[PDB]
Structures are given as structure tokens and as C-alpha cells.
């Protein structure tokens, strides 16, 4: 039965009991219900009026905090002689919540989630520290971040005609500004995102287990807009995500063992307890040993 | 125009802020809602569900063996069976539970707890136990005539399989506080102990050794505050395949 | 304590039950017109599909780790349910699950019986994801590798947050669970996604000093409110 | 948007200022008040004691 709850529950005064056919401390765990025994039935209580609030454990408050989701560093310079794998004054990132463990464990407390996502972008710069360079001051560069849908075409170079952004949303911002900010709506083809997915998202037998591309929000494509200077710099970009307007379903057992990979739930555990595969809690000498026992002298 | 001036705090980014911000996709229509079973709206709903205590946290117990306590017939009266530390912030038998895991995202707590025990011997096995809670102030009791002076229940094995011990909220202050100090007057909860009230008595065709499973939950007088990063997870490196998000 | 279940041409009785569980307090139903997506008139077979099917029994041994089955995968080749699955692109149903295990007043042991929504498994000690044949076991089901962490790096101790019952051999000889439709979409392709996993785990091992006998565990499952859309020629797994 | 301009004094920190400022802990519930003897509300109350 649903009700509105703003504070913790009050306690009522209680008397001696001695009554045949009545046993409120006995229960049947096999049914799958939790024990309904109340304090007034177990001991003699006083009256207490309880004013403790419950708002800091609301689901919106628990999940709606900006958390780090990407950190990328790259060199801002003339890239004419760089190797094929290098980020040449720009990079691509696929938006995900799988890479930094504090946000990942919190989202994985639930089976399905529906939210809008507030995105904040923070940029910092430093002079390259090779022995040819003195310090010189730091440039106030312009950057472009372009939103591109999951699987769509992305730019191939810093000066590509793809950056013309004729229908894609782009945000232009300077290092001297406050951090850039925008909101992405709930974009799923379904009524909620799947946090876990027990299946194969293709009609043939061959691909990966447990990844549904309908839960991938999109891509950010990021460049420096300025031409290269005569000297090199290192630029670092950090992205933060805050979920808002949240609904959540079907709570789950928390992650115990360390994460191995962004792609799956694979496990190994620590070498010794705590959080080892064969022992989650740290050991004590026996079930009769009290570990922080008070000594009086 | 309007005359204005800037305050201290202008242009800062605070991770707990709450403001509107520019929509990326104008005129976008999100997918219709439909009903889904099992919606949750306050984390105190999860904390009220029973989950298993790891009471047998000992070097020789492997995997699932850590989740049960074995008992057998004794030839001396009044004997101690086991004890449990109660500090819900620290590592110990209570930590990897629904109430333990959620509480470790917060710093202050208040309210009553319940422990429930299930007997898993044969139908022909009989016995009586006494379960005691001792409020703080000195050392954990080692004898039945010391422990029975505290809060307790006497349990008879029978057609009902299970019994509940209430741990009532008994504290000087409104909340207890997560220091990293188990012996603080703002943190310590006291002790739980279990003794034989009679003996475990079984016939020759039953197993001579029987097991208990112990469970814990919060009551609906429980509350949590001052949120923090959980100590139960962390990393020293990027995960495997993390570079693939940049490809 | 005493229960009778009756669906189609099938009935089950038990003299030692422990109530029954309705997952999240909800009961199965057909898809209403305000939640529907596909525009074709659905197939609704009623008593041809909505009846108990019984799987192969398994033996409870001293060293057993526990057992699992995935739904709808374990039923996709059985009776008229399997035939409707093979000829249609889309499926939807609930389920009623009944788990059976008996022994003497001299035996001891306890089973956790739990239904897990979206049970996405992990592999042990490797970076590579589980393959198609690790996941799709069909009617035979599988066994747990590391039941203490549910084969997903979480825990058995907290598994009581999901819909569950126990079989405790001194108390009861059966467990019963009712499951609604549980998905982010109103219907799905039955050959590639599983909504629910049934898990049976021996938390207290089987023991006695009486005469030794083989002690099986038996699973019976009934689909509820079945619907199918997008009729065509047959495809199997 | 609203047309605006900045005054002299913009961005300064004055130690006797009086403004609202951002809460660190959202949805926090402070401990209930209880009665305590000897409350003082103006320092001129103390100054009147011998």
C-alpha cells in the first residue's frame, strides 16, 4: 500500500505481555517475506516523537550529482610527422558510464533507468616540457564540441569540411570562459535504458553478449579551432555527467569484486581478503573472537 | 539597461548545483512511458529487506561456507556458541548486506535494527538457544549469567523455523557517527552473543551437526545523512578496453 | 500450507507449501491498447500454450554448486509454445514456476529459489566476454561456477532483493513464484533475449545418517497470457 | 536575454557581507532542537552582572 513519508516513524509506549496462542517474535523465513516483529512487541518501550527527515536518501538526490566520465590529453602542435594512431589536434569519444568506477557501481544498483543527462566540459593547458622549451605564458584557445549520433560519420582531420555542422548541434567555447554546459534528453528507442542486458543484439549468432547499442547515448567530436602555434602545448579535456528527472526499477545486489573491463561483468577478485573470490569479508581468528573488544583498566 | 554587480562564487562549477541548462535537441519528443514492475523512490525502501550476515568470517571457511554457523551437541552446561560485532560502518559480518552497503554511502545513521535466525537441522532435531544484545560501556560478555542481564530472547526450535531479535535504538545523541575509530563514544553500538539455553538433542539417524543462517534489516524508524564516495569500490588504472571509446 | 494449481489440461497439488510469491506484488496480463506498438491482430492461443511443462529432473549431491535455466530459452522447443515461437517474429508472456523436492524427517538441507531479471553473466579470470554456447543452454539449463558471487561479481548474501522463496527440508517440500512481463519494450524477439533466469542454490548442503537414496529436484513452468505477432515461415534455433 | 552592466565593487570579498550561498549537502536534516538552560541573545545581558 502506497503512502507519503517525510520523516522516520514514531514509537508508542508498551506494557507486560503473557498471552496464549500469540508469538510475535516467531516468523517463517521460507515464505520469502521479511520479519514483521515490531520493537513494542519485543521489549517494553517509551513514547517517542521522531522528527528525523528522509529526503537525503530520495533516488533523485542519490543519483543527481555531477561525476567524471571522460579524461583525455593530447598535443596541440604541427602534426605533419606524427604516427597514424595519434590524436592530431582533435579526438572522438563515445559517451558511456562504464569507465570510472564510482558512477558505474551507483548506476548498477538498478536494472532499468530513465533520465535526462546534463553535460559539463572542463579544459586545461600546459607548455610542453621538452628541453628545447622555456615557459612563455598560456594561449586562450577556442574549442568546438560536435554531437554525432551512435554509429554515424565523424571528422577525419582538424580542418575537415565535416566541421561545418549544418544539422548536428555544435558548442563553441574558450578556455577563459566558465566550463561549457548543455542538456541531452532521454533518447532511448525504449521507455527506459537497460543497465544490464541478458542477450545478443543481432539476428546472426556471432557478435558480443550483453551490449545493446540502443543504450549508447552518442558521440562527442572535439577539436581546437585555432591553427597551430610555433611551439607545442598539452591540452586536457574532462567531461562530467549529471542525471536528472530520474525514474528507477528493480534494485540489485551491489558489485563486490573489482571491475576488469568496460565491455562486461567479468571477475577475478583481490589476492587475499577483503574482496577476494573465496572471501569477501576480512578474517577473524574464530566465531567467538570479538574484533574491537573494549579493555578496561 | 539594468545596473548589476557580480558576487563571490561567480563562474565557479560546483558538482552538487541545481540549475536549468540549454537543450541540445530542440523540439525532441522522448519515447512514451509504460508501466514497469518494481519502481523504487527512496533508498530506505531497499534497506528494510532482510539479507544474509557473513558470521563465519574465518581463515578455514571457503565461499558459501562463510554464510552459515554449525552447531553440535555439548557435554557441559551454559556454553557460548558465537558473537557478532555491531558497527554498521566498519568491515565485518554486517558490511556486505543491503543495509551495510547502502549505509556506507553516508556518514551518520539512526534507528532500530532486526536480526532474524533460521534453523536448518532435520525435523527430528530439538533444542533451545538464548540471543542477547548488550549496550556499550565495557568488554563483550563471556558467560550466560552475565549476558542474560541485557536485552534478550529465548528461542525454542519447532514448527515455526525462525526467530527475531530486535536491536532497539539506545543512544545518547540523535545520530551515531562514522569516524575511523571503533572505540568512540559517538560510534560504538555494543555486542550480540548466542548461548545454549538447553542442548541440541537428535536421534542416531539424524546428522549430529546442524546449521543456522542469520539475516539483518533496518526498521522503518531508520535514517541516513551526509553522503560520501563509497569505500567498497576503487581503481588504480583504466579498465580493460577503455581506449576503445576513443576509436 | 496446502495448494492446488490448475491451468489448461494440467493440475498440481502440494501438501507442504509455504504460501506463494507474486513478483513485485504484480500479476500477469495481456498488452493494453494504450501500451501497444505492432499494428497486426495478435495470436492468443489460451489453453494450447498456457499450461504446465515439466523439465528433466536433476540430482542433489553432497558437492553440488546449484543450477540455472533462462526464459523463454528453456521452453522455445516444447509443445505448442515452441511451435508458436518458431513461426512468429514477436512474443510476450508471464510465467508461474513450481519447484519440487522431498526427503525424510531424518534429512537436512536448504535451497534458495530465486528469479533474477536480466541476469547478465560474467566469465572468470579473463577479459573476453561469454560466448553464445555459454549462455544459450535450452531445456538442460546450466550450473553455477561461483555461486557465492552469483557468477557476475556481486553476491549471494544480497540475492534476497529479488523475488524468491526457500525450500527448508524440515519445513516444506515445494516453492511457487508468479512472474509478470519484465522488459523495457512491450514485446521482444524470443530467440535472442531472456527476460528472467531461475536459479536454485544449496546454501545448506544435504545431510543424513539414515539409508542413502537419490534425492532429485524437479521444475514445472506454465506460461501465462501468451501473445504472438508477425506471422511467417518457421525458424528454429 | 536581460541587458545588464557591472557596478564598482563587483567581485570583491567584504568580511561583513550578508548574502545567501550554495548548500554543500542537499536534502540534509539537522538534529532536532531541545531545551538547554541559560540562553543568551544580546551581549548587554552579560554586561549587567557584577
Amino acid at each position: 500500500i502506497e503512502s507519503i513519508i517525510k520523516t522516520a516513524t514514531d514509537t508508542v509506549k508498551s506494557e507486560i505481555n503473557a498471552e496464549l496462542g500469540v508469538v510475535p517474535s516467531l516468523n517463517a523465513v521460507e515464505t520469502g517475506a521479511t520479519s514483521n516483529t515490531e520493537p513494542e512487541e519485543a521489549i517494553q518501550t517509551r513514547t517517542v516523537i521522531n522528527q528525523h527527515g528522509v529526503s537525503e536518501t530520495l533516488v533523485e538526490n542519490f543519483l543527481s550529482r555531477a561525476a567524471l566520465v571522460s579524461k583525455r590529453s593530447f598535443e596541440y602542435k604541427d602534426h605533419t610527422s606524427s604516427a597514424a594512431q595519434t590524436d592530431k589536434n582533435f579526438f572522438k569519444w563515445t559517451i558511456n558510464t562504464r569507465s570510472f568506477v564510482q558512477l558505474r557501481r551507483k548506476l548498477e544498483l538498478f536494472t532499468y533507468l530513465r533520465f535526462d543527462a546534463e553535460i559539463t566540459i572542463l579544459t586545461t593547458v600546459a607548455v610542453n616540457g621538452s628541453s628545447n622549451n622555456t615557459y612563455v605564458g598560456l594561449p586562450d584557445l577556442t574549442l568546438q564540441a560536435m554531437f554525432v549520433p551512435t554509429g554515424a560519420l565523424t571528422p577525419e582531420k582538424q580542418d575537415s569540411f565535416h566541421w561545418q555542422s549544418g544539422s548536428n548541434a555544435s558548442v563553441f567555447f574558450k578556455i577563459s570562459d566558465p566550463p561549457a554546459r548543455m542538456t541531452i534528453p532521454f533518447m532511448c528507442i525504449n521507455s527506459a535504458y537497460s543497465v544490464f542486458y541478458d542477450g545478443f543484439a543481432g539476428f546472426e549468432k556471432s557478435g558480443l553478449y550483453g551490449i545493446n547499442p540502443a543504450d549508447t547515448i552518442g558521440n562527442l567530436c572535439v577539436r581546437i579551432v585555432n591553427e597551430h602555434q610555433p611551439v607545442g602545448f598539452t591540452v586536457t579535456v574532462r567531461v562530467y555527467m549529471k542525471p536528472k528527472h530520474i525514474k528507477a526499477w528493480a534494485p540489485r545486489p551491489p558489485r563486490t569484486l573489482p571491475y576488469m573491463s568496460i565491455a562486461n561483468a567479468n571477475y577475478k577478485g583481490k589476492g587475499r581478503a577483503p574482496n577476494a573470490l573465496n572471501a569477501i569479508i576480512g578474517n577473524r581468528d574464530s566465531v567467538k573472537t570479538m574484533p574491537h573488544n573494549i579493555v578496561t583498566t | 539597461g539594468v545596473p548589476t554587480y557580480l558576487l563571490p562564487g561567480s563562474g565557479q562549477f560546483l558538482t552538487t548545483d541545481d540549475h536549468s541548462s540549454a537543450p541540445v535537441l530542440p523540439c525532441f519528443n522522448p519515447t512514451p512511458e509504460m508501466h514497469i514492475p518494481g519502481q523504487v523512490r527512496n533508498m530506505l525502501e531497499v534497506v528494510q529487506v532482510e539479507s544474509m550476515m557473513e558470521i563465519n568470517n574465518t581463515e578455514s571457511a571457503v565461499g558459501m561456507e562463510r554464510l552459515k554457523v554449525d552447531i553440535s551437541a555439548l557435554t557441559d552446561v551454559d556454553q557460548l556458541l558465537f558473537n557478532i560485532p555491531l558497527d554498521i560502518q566498519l568491515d565485518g559480518p554486517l558490511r556486505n548486506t543491503l543495509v551495510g552497503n547502502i549505509s556506507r554511502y553516508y556518514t551518520h545513521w539512526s534507528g532500530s535494527l532486526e536480526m532474524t535466525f533460521m534453523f536448518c537441522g532435520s525435523f527430528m532435531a530439538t533444542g533451545k538457544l538464548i540471543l542477547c544484545y548488550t549496550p556499550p560501556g565495557g568488554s563483550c560478555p563471556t558467560t550466560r549469567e552475565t549476558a542474560m542481564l541485557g536485552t534478550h530472547v529465548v528461542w525454542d526450535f519447532g514448527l515455526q523455523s525462525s526467530v527475531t531479535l530486535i536491536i532497539p535504538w539506545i543512544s545518547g545523541s540523535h545520530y551515531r557517527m562514522f569516524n575511523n575509530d571503533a572505540k568512540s563514544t559517538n560510534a560504538n553500538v555494543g555486542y550480540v552473543t548466542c548461548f545454549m539455553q538447553t542442548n541440541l538433542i537428535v536421534p542416531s539417524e539424524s546428522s549430529d551437526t546442524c546449521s543456522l543462517i542469520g539475516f539483518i534489516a533496518a526498521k522503518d524508524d531508520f535514517s541516513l545523512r551526509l553522503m560520501r564516495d563509497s569505500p567498497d569500490i576503487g581503481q588504480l588504472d583504466h579498465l580493460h578496453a577503455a581506449e576503445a571509446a576513443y576509436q | 500450507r496446502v495448494l492446488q494449481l490448475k491451468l489448461g489440461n494440467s493440475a498440481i497439488v502440494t501438501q507442504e507449501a509455504a504460501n506463494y510469491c507474486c513478483a513485485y506484488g504484480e500479476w500477469p496480463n495481456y498488452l493494453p491498447d494504450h501500451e501497444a506498438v505492432a499494428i497486426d491482430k495478435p495470436t492468443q492461443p489460451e489453453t494450447a500454450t498456457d499450461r504446465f511443462y515439466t523439465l528433466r529432473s536433476v540430482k542433489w549431491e553432497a558437492g553440488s554448486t546449484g543450477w540455472w535455466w533462462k526464459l523463454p530459452d528453456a521452453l522455445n522447443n516444447i509443445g505448442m509454445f515452441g511451435q508458436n515461437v518458431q513461426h512468429h517474429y514477436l512474443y510476450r508472456s508471464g510465467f508461474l514456476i513450481h519447484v519440487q523436492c522431498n526427503a525424510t524427517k531424518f534429512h537436512q538441507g536448504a535451497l534458495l529459489v530465486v528469479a533474477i531479471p536480466e541476469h547478465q553473466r560474467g566469465a572468470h579470470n579473463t577479459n573476453t566476454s561469454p560466448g553464445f554456447d555459454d549462455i544459450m543452454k535450452g531445456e538442460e539449463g546450466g550450473t553455477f561456477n561461483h555461486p557465492y558471487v552469483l557468477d557476475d561479481g556481486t553476491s549471494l548474501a544480497c540475492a534476497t532483493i529479488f523475488p524468491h522463496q526457500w525450500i527448508n527440508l524440515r519445513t516444506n517440500n515445494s516453492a511457487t513464484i508468479v512472474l509478470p512481463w519484465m522488459n523495457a519494450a512491450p514485446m521482444d524477439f524470443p530467440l535472442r533475449h531472456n527476460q528472467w533466469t531461475l536459479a536454485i542454490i544449496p546454501v545448506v548442503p544435504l545431510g543424513t545418517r539414515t539409508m542413502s537414496s537419490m534425492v532429485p529436484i524437479t521444475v514445472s513452468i506454465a506460461p501465462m497470457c501468451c501473445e504472438f505477432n508477425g506471422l511467417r515461415h518457421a525458424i528454429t534455433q | 536575454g536581460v541587458p545588464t552592466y557591472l557596478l564598482p565593487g563587483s567581485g570583491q570579498f567584504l568580511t561583513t557581507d550578508d548574502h545567501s550561498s550554495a548548500p554543500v549537502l542537499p536534502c540534509f536534516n539537522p538534529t532536532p532542537e531541545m531545551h538547554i538552560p541559560g540562553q543568551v541573545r544580546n551581549m548587554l545581558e552579560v554586561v549587567q552582572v557584577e
Partner: peptide, 30 residues
Amino acid sequence: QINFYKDSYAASASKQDFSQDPSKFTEPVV
């Protein structure tokens, strides 16, 4: 609360739903 944007998803967070039902997890039996 200040919001001059045209799309409702741009708005600030929603911290005011105090409704609960623990019994869907604590008492799911007949």
C-alpha cells in the same frame, strides 16, 4: 526556480516525490 528555455527537459532537478511502498520488496506474498 528559473527556466526560460522552450523544452521542458531543460529544467532543474525534481526533489519532491515522497511516496513509498516497501511492501513490493518486503511482503510479496498472498
